[PDB]
Amino acid sequence: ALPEEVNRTLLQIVQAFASDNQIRSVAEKALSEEWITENNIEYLLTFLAEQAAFSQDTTVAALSAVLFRKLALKAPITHIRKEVLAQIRSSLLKGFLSERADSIRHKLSDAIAECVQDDLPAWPELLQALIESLKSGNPNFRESSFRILTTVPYLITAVDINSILPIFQSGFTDASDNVKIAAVTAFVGYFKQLPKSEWSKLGILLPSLLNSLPRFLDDGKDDALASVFESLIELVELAPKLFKDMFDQIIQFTDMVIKNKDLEPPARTTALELLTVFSENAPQMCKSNQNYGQTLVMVTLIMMTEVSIDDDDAAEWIESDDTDDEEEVTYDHARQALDRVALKLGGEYLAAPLFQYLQQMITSTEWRERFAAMMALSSAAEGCADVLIGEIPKILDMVIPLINDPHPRVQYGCCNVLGQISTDFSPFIQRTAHDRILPALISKLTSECTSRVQTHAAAALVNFSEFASKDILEPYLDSLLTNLLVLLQSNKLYVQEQALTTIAFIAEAAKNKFIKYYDTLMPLLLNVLKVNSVLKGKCMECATLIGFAVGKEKFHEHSQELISILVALQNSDALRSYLEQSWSRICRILGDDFVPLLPIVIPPLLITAKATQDVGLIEEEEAANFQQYPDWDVVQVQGKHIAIHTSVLDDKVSAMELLQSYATLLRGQFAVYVKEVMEEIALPSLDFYLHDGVRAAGATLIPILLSCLLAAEELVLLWHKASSKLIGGLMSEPMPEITQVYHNSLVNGIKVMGDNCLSEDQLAAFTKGVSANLTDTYERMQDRDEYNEDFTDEDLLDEINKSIAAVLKTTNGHYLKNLENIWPMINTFLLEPILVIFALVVIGDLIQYEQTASMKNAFIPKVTECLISPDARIRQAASYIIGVCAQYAPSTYADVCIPTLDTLVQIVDGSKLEENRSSTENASAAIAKILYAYNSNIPDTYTANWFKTLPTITDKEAASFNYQFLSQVCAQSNISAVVDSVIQALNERSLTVISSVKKLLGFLPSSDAMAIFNRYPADIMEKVHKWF
């Protein structure tokens, strides 16, 4: 179909691709600069389709198929002439139906798929080819057809339903494993790609798929089973309820696989994953079935015993360092599975089945089962905390006896649990089980025990210490410390390292109680450092945490020598980060005396925090293996593939956070760096579209930088620059969580910069940003079923409220004008609770600045509704609005405020209860506002009602009004309720009303005055003396 000249030019080029730099680079330029142009592109696509279809050379065929796939997207296929699309399609199809190597048929299939499209003409020859190939006796034809149905799931819609059903059923049951896997993959891909409204049309095939599964175990084809479990895992995340009717059968099947422990791990790990993922996607369904929980606990307990296989003494485990053995695959998987399901389902549902088994495993003569027991509890404790936090003596009764098990791995197991639960049941467990936990861990520290066990116990003392007060640790310190010094003398590096960190963290919790241990510890530490990088880092960490615990005066006995060692250490990669945190901690200890060390510490942080977005424009194939590295990720942004060096950008964050924390501590003393950090780090960081941590860390740096310069023209320039990039980010930023940080960052910027810190264009550009943010939140939220059982959004709206309020205040009202343009938006929200709360909160801010009449009619009907809402947050925002009406718009509002006033006397009356103490306090303030505005114009029972709502202890601005009103009830024997109403507010720290009160007590004898405080305990009488 091509001129013969064109053919050997193109042939030469494509053949040059395999090869030398010269021949191959000349071809590369030729292709990209000469052949992919409006004028040659169709010739090029025609050629490549011909080669892939007909070439007898493997390499040329393959390459052309790949190239065609790549270039056919870019063209794109849509702007190709009809006569040439047709010809390309026809040859691609003839190639597919001819004799090709498997991998070329795969590449042809991928090329064919690029030629099937919404706006492209119908290709009914494809449809026909796929149906016939599916019946071919050649697996490669069957497999390749399902591969095309995977790339282009719309084709499945286009075949008659009575053909496509038997196609998949024959597919699931095919003699070829490869065809099975491709059938499964195409079947699940359909649900991946199509709207839910199309799902019911293949959904009916699920039981045929599930019914095909036992055959994989009959044939002993477990690797193939694993891949099918993988597709099934993706189907659970898309349509868990499709599994409802056969739920027991899948549970029992996964059970059966995992028990067959001659199977290789992949079938067993993916089976477990399939089990696990129901708890994440259909928690009601798992909970409505006692079998799920029982099987899930049983099979993770089986897998947790699979340790030290063929090594009963644990010699290998005893002899190694305190890391995980990465050969213990099923055991690792079982621990994260139990944890994951516990976290989803809660203890109400799993503790019973869990405990049924543990009671029994604790007593086995198989050590593996006694260990399993401890590790299973360790996995489940957090998710089951709601129940287990109450059964804490019972748990210690089981665990603590094992601390002395003959087998050192069971001992390590028990250390593990005491550690895990010191975290998960904190702070309650530190208060109530210190007397059992500490002696138990401390007994393992002795050099009688194995290195692994001493180390594990020392690690568990970090978990305990984290949430133990200095007073609880105090009687245990000398004993803790004398033991850990012995650990410090071990011959094993990892015991020393753990010893050091354990002492550091105990010292952190001990605080000033650690002062007496400083003189024994500090020289031991100095000696280690003067002499094993990690040891030195953990040692400097230990020293500076001891520093922070004992305070600056005591830290001064060794600070200069310690600082000189740091210097030597820094200027000489796990080390880097211990060094930087230690400098940062010295800054917290020394305060302003750190200032002379800034030139040592800051420059290296400047370098790291200037890191650029290190991107590599990359190719499809050349990814995946790039992805292997934990330090790289690849994403698709606009069609193309990009490799981004993630670690480097994480390090840029880390450095930005340290700069941020120096700037926060040093305030005006950091000013010298502000310009440079702002222009070279904070601001360019907002443009880092490939890493959101950077963008957020850039945003939080902004207000802090400004505030440093403030405390020490530029300020105004930088603020203008920074606010404008913040504003601009609001219309472009794709991630809602980042959007939030920008609003918060504006709010904090405004708070720093003060009055009228914004210009008119900025106020207008902010409005558009606020509107686009509101528009996209609406859109995402009007998207939340047959198949299935967002604080992110709530939080973003929370902050938008703050920024609007903040902008209103800095403009001193003038932002009302701009605010008018998004009123339709606001109004839709007002009439789904999160959108409502938002809108009410906005309107309360509006009124704060009688020019709102324009909207009285548009909102009070819904606000009055909201007053009696079942949701406390709605009532709260509602009443605030009614109260603010009478405060700032007294007169354009009365026909409303006085009517509602009875509503408020009722909302006022589970009122005084934690959950809604806040809502009823606003109503209370709201009625006091009405009573003020229209003072002796009111039809007075009211005020005596209002009174019985005192005290106001939770909402501060409410309390502030109520006691202002209280200060404008008299005499009587209301007197002790009058006073206490005030003592309560003060003591609870929610709120000159004192002056008013002392006047009332003036009107009574010596003895009558005194007696009122007679009820108050010593501590609040100390305060009352200092108040009156």
Binding site: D339, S378, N416, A459, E466
Partner: peptide, 12 residues
């Protein structure tokens, strides 16, 4: 990690 903690989740 120099305290007790759980292994990282293995999903996607």
């Amino acid at each position: 990690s120099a305290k007790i903690s759980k292994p990282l989740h293995i999903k996607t």
